[PDB]
Structure formats: C-alpha cells, structure tokens
Design a protein around this ligand. Structure first.
Ligand SMILES: O=C(O)c1ccc2c(c1)CN(Cc1csc(N3C[C@@H]4C[C@@H](CN(c5ccccc5)C4)C3)n1)CC2
Ligand SMILES: O=C(O)c1ccc2c(c1)CN(Cc1csc(N3C[C@@H]4C[C@@H](CN(c5ccccc5)C4)C3)n1)CC2
Ligand SMILES: [Cl-]
Lengths: 125, 125
C-alpha cells in the first residue's frame, strides 16, 4: 500500500505561488500517491480526500480561509501535517498556524524557493 | 451562552469587529475578551476559548489561515457556527467556508456593514 498524500494550497495563489505548488506536488508523487491525482460538493469531497490521507502538506504562504480550514480539520482528524512557509514573501505566518506546531506531527518549515525539493526529500526519508 | 468571536488579525474590518463584539455582549459572555513560545501561547489560549464556547461567530471577509483554522477546529468540536461575510468587499468567499454551511449548525450570512447589528439580533432571537 502506497502512502496517501494530501496537498493543499490557496485557490487565490498567484503565478509564483502556483509554480511552487506544481513543484511541491511533482516531488510528492515520488513518495506516495497524491490523493487529488456546488460549494457543498467541493467541501464534502475535499474532506473525504483529507480523511484518507496519511500526511497533509500545506503551502501556507498565501493567507486562505480554505487552507486554514483544511489544517483545522486535519488536526482534529489526527493527521501528520507539514506546513511550508516562504518568509521571502514579506508576510508573517498566522500565530494559529505557527502556534499549532509541535515539532513532530505538526511542523512548520520556513523555506526559500530553491530548496523546496531538498526539504521535501529530507522530510519524506 | 458562552460566545466566541474571531476575525482576521490583518481598518474598516477592525472597527466592524468591535461593533460585532459589543452586540454579542447583549446575548452572553464573550469568552475571547477575557485572558511554550508566544505563537503556542496564542494557539492554546484560543483553543481554550473555542472549546468552552456554545456559539462561534466568525467574520470571514478577510482571507485568514487563523480564522479558517479556528472554523476547522470548531466544526470538529461540533460547535454552532455563524459566519459573517461582506460581499461589498468584492471578494469571493472560499468554497470551503461556503460549502461547510448546512443552514442550521453552520450558517454563512452575507451582510452589509451598517446592518450587522440587525443580523445578530435576527440570529440570537
Ligand atoms: O483557497 C481556498 O479558499 C481553497 C478553496 C477550496 C479548496 C482549497 C483551497 C484547497 N483544497 C486542497 C487542494 C487540493 S489540490 C490543491 N491545490 C491548491 C490550489 C491549486 C491546485 C488546485 N486547487 C483546488 C483543487 C480543487 C478544488 C479547489 C482548488 C487549488 C492545487 N489544493 C481543495 C479545495
Ligand atoms: O488572522 C489570524 O491569523 C489570526 C491569528 C490569531 C488569532 C486570530 C486570528 C483570531 N482569534 C480569535 C479572536 C479572539 S478576539 C479576535 N478579534 C479579531 C482580531 C482583532 C481583535 C483581536 N484579535 C486577537 C485576539 C487575541 C489574540 C490574537 C488576535 C484579532 C478581536 N479574534 C485569536 C487568535
Ligand atoms: Cl496542534
């Protein structure tokens, strides 16, 4: 059985954010199966993918109620979670996400655009 | 009835949060106005307020990982939730929040700034 990996990022992410999302998702395929590969239907199916994940990887650089909501549901589902944040964006990460980290099943890793594949190789090995 | 309020930590939204809290005081104790690193302290205090609440009121106009996270945790705790969104902002509310609504235990209400007080009366009576 392959590990089930759930990726989440903002639907409002820009061109830079979306290039990094594709780079994270491409690298995730090496370590397991990426589950993703009206509004009520999106909510229900997203929660079903999330419930079936072994690991949740969230890119939390861009503020998002949807990503935050997925992280809150993921914690209550007892999921192992890795949050990836780019301090080069000029933003400060929400105290709720940074404060949810416990250094083990909820980690928040700051990163520079260039090292994302190397940080993902390290986390998943 | 113990009431929990949340809004984005990131002007016109900040004065609205004060009016919302003042109006909620008329219906019950607002837990969120009464009082490991700093982020973890904010997370833990916020979760203590959230677990003690009977009703969760969230201002969801500004995209926020923190507000979304609180809403995710609130749903999992089976809390009664009211989300307030201002369509005048020009934003499209996240599908995760709009899709979480069931018209009963979780409701999302579009409102106009001047009429927020009336909407809270209609909900709490
Ligand atoms: O920001 C919001 O308010 C929001 C609202 C709804 C959802 C999310 C975020 C994220 N959820 C998890 C998820 C799965 S794949 C993924 N990304 C991130 C970006 C780009 C691309 C496709 N995404 C997507 C996929 C399906 C439905 C909607 C958006 C959005 C890859 N994110 C899905 C539902
Ligand atoms: O958007 C974020 O990433 C974010 C990060 C952290 C928290 C929130 C949001 C919201 N939580 C709920 C809460 C309680 S009183 C409240 N509001 C909303 C605004 C203005 C004012 C003071 N707030 C506040 C109060 C205590 C601690 C921190 C911020 C923030 C009144 N919101 C608290 C923690
Ligand atoms: Cl946690």
């Amino acid at each position: 059985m392959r590990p089930a990996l759930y990726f989440c990022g903002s639907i409002r992410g820009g061109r830079e954010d979306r290039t990094l999302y594709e780079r994270i998702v491409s690298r995730l395929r090496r370590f397991g199966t990426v589950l993703t590969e009206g509004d009520r239907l999106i909510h229900e199916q997203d929660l079903e993918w999330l419930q079936q994940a072994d690991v949740v990887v969230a890119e939390v650089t861009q503020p998002s109620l949807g990503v935050g909501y997925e992280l809150g549901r993921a914690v209550a589902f007892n999921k192992r979670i890795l949050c990836l944040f780019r301090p080069q964006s000029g933003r400060v990460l929400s105290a709720m996400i940074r404060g949810a980290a416990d250094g083990s099943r909820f980690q928040v890793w700051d990163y520079e655009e260039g090292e994302v594949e190397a940080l993902l190789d390290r986390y998943f090995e």
